[PDB]
Symmetry: C5
Amino acid sequence: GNMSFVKETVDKLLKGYDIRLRPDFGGPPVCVGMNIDIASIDMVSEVNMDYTLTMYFQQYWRDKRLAYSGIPLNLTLDNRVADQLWVPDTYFLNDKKSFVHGVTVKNRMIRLHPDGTVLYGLRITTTAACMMDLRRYPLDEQNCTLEIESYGYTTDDIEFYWRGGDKAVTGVERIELPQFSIVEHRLVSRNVVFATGAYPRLSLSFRLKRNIGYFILQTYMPSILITILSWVSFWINYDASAARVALGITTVLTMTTINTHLRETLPKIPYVKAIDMYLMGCFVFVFLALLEYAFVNYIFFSQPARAAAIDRWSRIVFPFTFSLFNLVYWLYYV
Amino acid sequence: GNMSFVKETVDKLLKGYDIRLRPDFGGPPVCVGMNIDIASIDMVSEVNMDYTLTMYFQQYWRDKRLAYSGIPLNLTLDNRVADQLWVPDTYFLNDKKSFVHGVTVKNRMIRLHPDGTVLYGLRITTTAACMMDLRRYPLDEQNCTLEIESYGYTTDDIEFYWRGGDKAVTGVERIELPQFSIVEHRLVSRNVVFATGAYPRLSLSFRLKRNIGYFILQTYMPSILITILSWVSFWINYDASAARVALGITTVLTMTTINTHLRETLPKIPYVKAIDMYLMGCFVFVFLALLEYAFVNYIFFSQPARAAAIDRWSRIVFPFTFSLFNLVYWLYYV
Amino acid sequence: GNMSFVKETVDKLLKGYDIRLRPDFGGPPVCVGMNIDIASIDMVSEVNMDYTLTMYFQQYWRDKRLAYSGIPLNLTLDNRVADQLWVPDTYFLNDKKSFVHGVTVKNRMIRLHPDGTVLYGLRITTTAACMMDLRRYPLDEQNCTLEIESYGYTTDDIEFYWRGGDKAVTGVERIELPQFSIVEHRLVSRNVVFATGAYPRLSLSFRLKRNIGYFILQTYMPSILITILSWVSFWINYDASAARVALGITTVLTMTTINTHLRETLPKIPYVKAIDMYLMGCFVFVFLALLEYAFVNYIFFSQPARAAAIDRWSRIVFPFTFSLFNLVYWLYYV
Amino acid sequence: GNMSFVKETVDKLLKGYDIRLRPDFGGPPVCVGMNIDIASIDMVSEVNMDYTLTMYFQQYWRDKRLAYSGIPLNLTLDNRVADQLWVPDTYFLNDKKSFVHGVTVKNRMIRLHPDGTVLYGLRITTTAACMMDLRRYPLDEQNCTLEIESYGYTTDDIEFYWRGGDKAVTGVERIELPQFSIVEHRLVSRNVVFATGAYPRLSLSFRLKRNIGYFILQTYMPSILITILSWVSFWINYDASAARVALGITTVLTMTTINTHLRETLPKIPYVKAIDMYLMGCFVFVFLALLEYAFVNYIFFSQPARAAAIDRWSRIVFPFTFSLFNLVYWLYYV
Amino acid sequence: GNMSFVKETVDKLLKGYDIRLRPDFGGPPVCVGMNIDIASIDMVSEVNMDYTLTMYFQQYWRDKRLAYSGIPLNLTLDNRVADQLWVPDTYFLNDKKSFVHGVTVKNRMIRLHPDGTVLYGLRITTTAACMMDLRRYPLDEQNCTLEIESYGYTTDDIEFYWRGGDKAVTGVERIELPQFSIVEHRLVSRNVVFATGAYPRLSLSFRLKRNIGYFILQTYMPSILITILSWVSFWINYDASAARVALGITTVLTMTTINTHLRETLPKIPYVKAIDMYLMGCFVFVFLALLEYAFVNYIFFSQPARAAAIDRWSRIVFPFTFSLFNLVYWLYYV
Ligand SMILES: *[C@@H]1O[C@H](CO)[C@@H](O[C@@H]2O[C@H](CO)[C@@H](O[C@@H]3O[C@H](CO[C@H]4O[C@H](CO)[C@@H](O)[C@H](O)[C@@H]4O)[C@@H](O)[C@H](O[C@H]4O[C@H](CO)[C@@H](O)[C@H](O)[C@@H]4O)[C@@H]3O)[C@H](O)[C@H]2NC(C)=O)[C@H](O)[C@H]1NC(C)=O
Ligand SMILES: *[C@@H]1O[C@H](CO)[C@@H](O[C@@H]2O[C@H](CO)[C@@H](O[C@@H]3O[C@H](CO[C@H]4O[C@H](CO)[C@@H](O)[C@H](O)[C@@H]4O)[C@@H](O)[C@H](O[C@H]4O[C@H](CO)[C@@H](O)[C@H](O)[C@@H]4O)[C@@H]3O)[C@H](O)[C@H]2NC(C)=O)[C@H](O)[C@H]1NC(C)=O
Ligand SMILES: *[C@@H]1O[C@H](CO)[C@@H](O[C@@H]2O[C@H](CO)[C@@H](O[C@@H]3O[C@H](CO[C@H]4O[C@H](CO)[C@@H](O)[C@H](O)[C@@H]4O)[C@@H](O)[C@H](O[C@H]4O[C@H](CO)[C@@H](O)[C@H](O)[C@@H]4O)[C@@H]3O)[C@H](O)[C@H]2NC(C)=O)[C@H](O)[C@H]1NC(C)=O
Ligand SMILES: *[C@@H]1O[C@H](CO)[C@@H](O[C@@H]2O[C@H](CO)[C@@H](O[C@@H]3O[C@H](CO[C@H]4O[C@H](CO)[C@@H](O)[C@H](O)[C@@H]4O)[C@@H](O)[C@H](O[C@H]4O[C@H](CO)[C@@H](O)[C@H](O)[C@@H]4O)[C@@H]3O)[C@H](O)[C@H]2NC(C)=O)[C@H](O)[C@H]1NC(C)=O
Ligand SMILES: *[C@@H]1O[C@H](CO)[C@@H](O[C@@H]2O[C@H](CO)[C@@H](O[C@@H]3O[C@H](CO[C@H]4O[C@H](CO)[C@@H](O)[C@H](O)[C@@H]4O)[C@@H](O)[C@H](O[C@H]4O[C@H](CO)[C@@H](O)[C@H](O)[C@@H]4O)[C@@H]3O)[C@H](O)[C@H]2NC(C)=O)[C@H](O)[C@H]1NC(C)=O
Ligand SMILES: *[C@@H]1O[C@H](CO)[C@@H](O)[C@H](O)[C@H]1NC(C)=O
Ligand SMILES: *[C@@H]1O[C@H](CO)[C@@H](O)[C@H](O)[C@H]1NC(C)=O
Ligand SMILES: *[C@@H]1O[C@H](CO)[C@@H](O)[C@H](O)[C@H]1NC(C)=O
Ligand SMILES: *[C@@H]1O[C@H](CO)[C@@H](O)[C@H](O)[C@H]1NC(C)=O
Ligand SMILES: *[C@@H]1O[C@H](CO)[C@@H](O)[C@H](O)[C@H]1NC(C)=O
């Protein structure tokens, strides 16, 4: 309760305190416990292969140089005192753009304990790279990880562990991804050996399952219906050259128009995906449907009996082949 | 009026003043009163699920260490003196990108009072996350909130309240949102219990009702008219194969062209919305209209009497079914 | 000419100088004169409702504490000395993103005078919010203002005025806006009363008239010509079912294609504009033109004499109605 | 070779050195020589009317206060010593976003000479505004300039000149612009009189000639071919109503589709360009081609002899008028 | 193990240490060894002609002033001590936007050795300019280089070499480029002579081979199929004017629609590419196919025998010419 007495204690601790030396320098490595309180996942971008994450990053360790006695209450110092202490050189291995919020003040917390324990919390919005195998898009399951490592110190100087076991990372249930749904998150602690030596490593991975309801209604359904309309020409009198030619080519034109516009809406990733195969697969059927009439029209004059046979056979072969195409497609990717 | 006397008083207050210790450290929590003067809401983005807000954020508390006597006038110190005082660690829970304007100087105000009262104002442009339930888009009502909390101190160390009751937040009437209209704003004061303890919480929520006039004229009206034109083929002589086939497929082509282009203009949110159901609902009718002629054309030769019956029945069934589709659609989402 | 003597004078002025106290603290308010030398207006964005402005912002006031004698020449100190003086807390009320250029050095000027007069110039590129009433777009006239106010001090502590009267703001004639043309700029000085008290206010407003030549050629002209082509079907033999049906629906398809693509090129503002009414107005005529043939075709067999009467009457009613539509449109918005 | 002796010399020079006073304060103006080593021109944006430039900006002047004796070798001090010296307040008049690279260290060089000469180099990536007269786009020649001026000091206090004459600016030959080709660069030294007095001015201008090969193949060629296909209807039997009507309107539809999509690819500049006139010029011919058939079809029944005369005359008038249109277009803009 | 003894040693080394003087000032140049541990290549943008690179940049040199004795263990000081030492002025010649990550702390490592050796590591995300010769796009092979040079010091003052020979740069095998595949990387050490003198240079170049699977399926395949459908009109009865005219023009319309939409998806680079020639090459065949029918239709009445000869000859000439076009195209660019 005595502010002057507390002020003297803090100045005494900081007097002779060297920030360039880790706790227990030259001795056993300092154990650091880390908890993450995830606030939200802002976006998951397939074009940039990254996801934006906002979280409360806390580090828990003990520094004997900061131990104080006589004050039972835990000291909650101002965030500006963190520049005068020693903090682990924790950094994220796969981040691309990370920053600490500073409104109204820097979102930073320093809390001291009588036994020298230090609690250090940060609110960080980081963009972590996540390579995606989008061959089975949009029926794919992604695994995006956040890697935590010490930049300068080795395992002999510092050790990382998840404070709380599997309960170290919270707030996953509150994440609301419009496109994905979180299935499972895992916590991994391991040591990685590099050229300069072993380093502590902490990993936070998510397995994301993409929602398919939007793509079925917006992408797959229009393509199927246009393919169905291409079969209308089969149930048309062969003498109506204008009707079947116009119907066949317009369906090809309609298929191209939807296919080109979807690509612009879809991510700009330049490699073959599951949706691209299906759309080009349907484009073959409308291409074959128009070619079917050309063969019928050419031989209609010479062999009218055979021409009608091809027209009625196409009424079964095309729906049967298309169903087999869907059966192969919807089992290979599911 | 004596500048030298005032200068001595300020230096005396700052002498022995510790920024690392909150007012009444070790005693009752310091009560902080907060008022918000909203300037404008820059944008409300559905793609990023966030809204940009510009406001004058003011904090009101009392620090006995800064109390001075002999000068009746309230001291309006320079903004650069705020770095030498103690200010609450107020931060916004759901913000994404927030900053304080600094042109020409930092938009910051420090005002002192004889009884130790401190007034601290900031002009902050913050981007706050707002998860949106856009299933009923564009006929949806959104509720975006701004959450205020203390990062480090608990309820035992600091307490938050709205200075002025329901009058704490002003400027809502002056907000001009081109797309939304503000219906109601609420002020909520509560304490939230976390792992580290209870924290003060202040909430500022808005309920936004989206305007529909643009979407009715630009999106719903063109789709209805194209659907109406699909019924023109019913009032066409059945022998005109070229006329009805061309009309039917072009309406399907026209429906696809407008549908694909609207999606690019509409937000890239990948899930089913109210507008998507309506556009795909209308796309079924034009799909059925073309299929209706195919059935009529196939049986026209064998049963001309029955074929004409189907053509005239479609003149009533299709308009009646479409009206029922609108009746269900315009009551479910309204 | 004596550098050592000048160096001693500046140090003497800064000795005992308090930046936390305004000139004549506790006395009459300090009058500040402001001139603006506008360099260019970078952009005027309708989507974001803001305009980017680059200008030379200068402030002119007198501080007796900085008065010096013995040196007739005006002192032009380095820009880094501004951090050691007192400058007004001038800020822009409606700015969104503002910064001071710092290449190669900070674009800042401090000039001292023997009578204590201080000249303070800044080169600022600010993005100021400008709400636009785009109902009459693109035939609208916009009024974008830049508001200048003191953040902390009231009218009792500081007063604002335009140094030079109507000549305070220059460089308006040199502004080259590709889309707009500046018609008139006004300077307004007023005092605004808030909860904390009255504040000085300086306003710089522009009235922008949008150019219409681009929209007439690129948007209005194609729509008119397509509407004219819809009347071609009237001068077509009624027995040619394929010709008139194809012409009617393709014009509807052509009207939709241009209408959808223009919206993407046009700003994403979601409310009804003047151009939207005209494009949807023309879309009705092509919709009615196709409906006109359907009525003629249906009754052509039963009453060929009446069907020809409707076809020839449409050759006059449609051009006359369209001209009246333009006459109403081009007088309501002009 | 004696590091201690060199360290003493530098400290002696900085002792008593005032950064707020220019060299020869109160005397003749200090002459500054400037050389530019252009690295690359990143982009030339027509939408934003600016170009991004990366260069090595060096300033050359003499300060007698920094003169040292006894050390023949030129001193190459660390970049962090520039904050302790006096440097000209050089800034770019027409820049929009400029910065100095700071990886790994700040790209800044300070070099001292025994005679007091100071060399000051910076690596700056600046975005300079360049108003473009794009009426003749894409057959236009642009002139983008970089303006150099002193922010605070007048001609009486500082003078600018190009160190090396016409050889001051190098690296122009190494610039690789994908769209433009540099024709000529000029160096201009002049004094500009403002309200506060005369200022030194250095100008670096480029004259850029736009490449036309891409636009000829991608924009002009498709438009010409579609216009040619519109003349196919002339060599079609007049009795084929379906063939000529479909061909005429589809060419109009094809012309609209390419015209609308090009505008989105082309810059969003809202004023008439050379390409816009040509595309709308070709759109008239296809509009007239369809109108030509309407006149022929209407009078074909009454006067078949005259109708055939118009059809064969259109086979010559349209190609001749189109060639004259190109002859006027390709000479007015070339 | 004695923290106080280590603290005294570091302070002794920093006492009298001058950062403005390079090691062995006035003597032999200081040799700097550099290793790069590439983390990932974020993107390779053809529009901006740059690639984003994330790497661990380490510098290895010896400074005798920092040599210490008595402590066998290598000192791993805090990253904040780097501001108090001397580090090479290493910068990247062709970078555009480069920064050092600073979350949670600045990603910087300083390690000292008893023999005065200093290890200095940085984690840098740099955007390096890479001019691309995209004439053969998308069948092109690109060569993007990262250039390393000393900004201020010449070869007489500093020398650069790759520490580890060809093993200096690692992590290339772990790079996952979705569009490109890394073929070979080279390390080059050379001295470049400029106006101010020779400078050390280190180069890291990559040769990237673009994947073609996406472009074959998405771009080349649709164009070929539409060209094939243009040959359908050859196997159509010549009397069917409506069928062949509609098929010919719609294929031209279909070719234009896909061609225009691909350009928007493709990079905005304004010069002729390999893909542009192929798409315009195919557009000629559909243009010639429609022209072929016009010649046949015109002379069908006068010379029916000759008209049928042209129709059957087109069934061979067009497929043969198209195959030769592909044979020339697929050998010139491969
Ligand atoms: C996304 O993809 C990443 C990989 O790219 C997955 O990460 C892997 O996760 C698994 C767990 O699901 C990890 O496997 C575990 O590794 C632990 C650490 O191993 C280190 O230490 C041991 C010695 O103790 C060494 O042998 C080893 O080489 C490492 O140095 C182990 O301790 C775990 O063992 C436990 O489980 C196994 C069964 O799995 C038991 O047999 C053991 O007895 C013990 O109980 C386990 O092996 C794996 O290391 C991770 N890989 C990487 C690269 O981090 C993510 O899981 C994935 N995302 C999701 C959501 O699954
Ligand atoms: C957007 O959506 C958010 C929710 O996501 C809405 O926020 C809620 O707003 C309501 C008010 O409209 C809040 O309800 C009020 O909470 C107050 C605080 O409760 C705390 O303290 C009490 C004890 O005093 C505890 O029991 C409780 O658990 C909390 O810890 C209460 O004091 C209020 O009670 C008053 O009103 C009720 C009637 O509503 C009376 O019965 C009471 O006697 C008393 O007068 C009230 O319950 C709610 O807490 C808010 N939720 C959140 C999560 O903040 C926004 O309102 C919405 N936007 C709009 C525009 O509506
Ligand atoms: C864009 O839109 C803005 C408004 O949103 C316009 O700004 C207005 O501009 C007009 C002038 O064109 C301003 O009117 C003038 O206000 C001055 C200040 O008034 C204050 O002080 C008086 C007492 O002196 C109080 O009564 C008053 O309430 C204010 O506190 C007056 O001094 C002016 O009076 C002079 O002109 C009038 C005639 O206009 C004479 O009758 C008087 O005798 C005297 O000569 C005048 O009234 C108005 O205040 C501005 N509004 C705002 C909100 O700033 C922009 O002009 C417009 N853009 C363009 C290009 O026009
Ligand atoms: C892009 O567009 C800009 C203009 O917007 C062009 O810049 C102009 O460039 C020309 C040179 O090509 C400049 O003309 C030269 O100006 C020099 C400076 O003039 C100042 O000083 C004189 C007195 O010495 C004053 O009278 C004058 O008012 C100025 O204050 C002159 O010294 C030059 O004279 C020399 O050449 C002329 C012939 O051109 C001879 O007759 C003379 O004897 C002498 O040898 C000359 O007049 C012009 O000033 C520039 N304008 C601006 C605004 O900077 C760029 O050139 C253009 N880009 C390209 C690539 O051309
Ligand atoms: C992307 O494109 C760049 C060029 O734009 C390529 O970079 C070139 O790479 C080659 C190697 O593949 C470099 O050639 C080598 O240069 C070394 C340095 O030369 C300097 O020093 C010598 C004297 O020692 C001077 O004569 C010379 O002028 C330079 O000042 C040489 O030491 C190398 O010689 C070795 O190899 C050759 C055979 O190649 C042997 O004959 C020699 O005996 C010796 O073993 C060699 O000549 C070239 O300098 C680079 N150019 C630039 C501008 O950097 C990239 O390689 C390319 N990307 C890929 C993936 O290939
Ligand atoms: C606080 O401690 C100081 C120093 O021992 C002492 O003088 C003062 O009386 C104490 N105050 C209280 C309230 O204990
Ligand atoms: C201001 O206070 C000082 C110190 O007491 C005194 O010397 C001076 O005369 C005072 N001036 C006025 C105007 O009261
Ligand atoms: C400048 O002033 C100093 C201090 O009075 C004096 O010693 C010196 O001689 C003066 N120099 C000149 C040139 O007047
Ligand atoms: C460097 O100069 C100092 C000071 O004069 C002297 O003591 C020392 O011996 C000199 N060293 C050399 C190598 O000249
Ligand atoms: C560390 O060194 C100091 C200074 O010599 C000495 O007083 C102290 O006893 C030493 N401690 C240990 C553990 O060696």
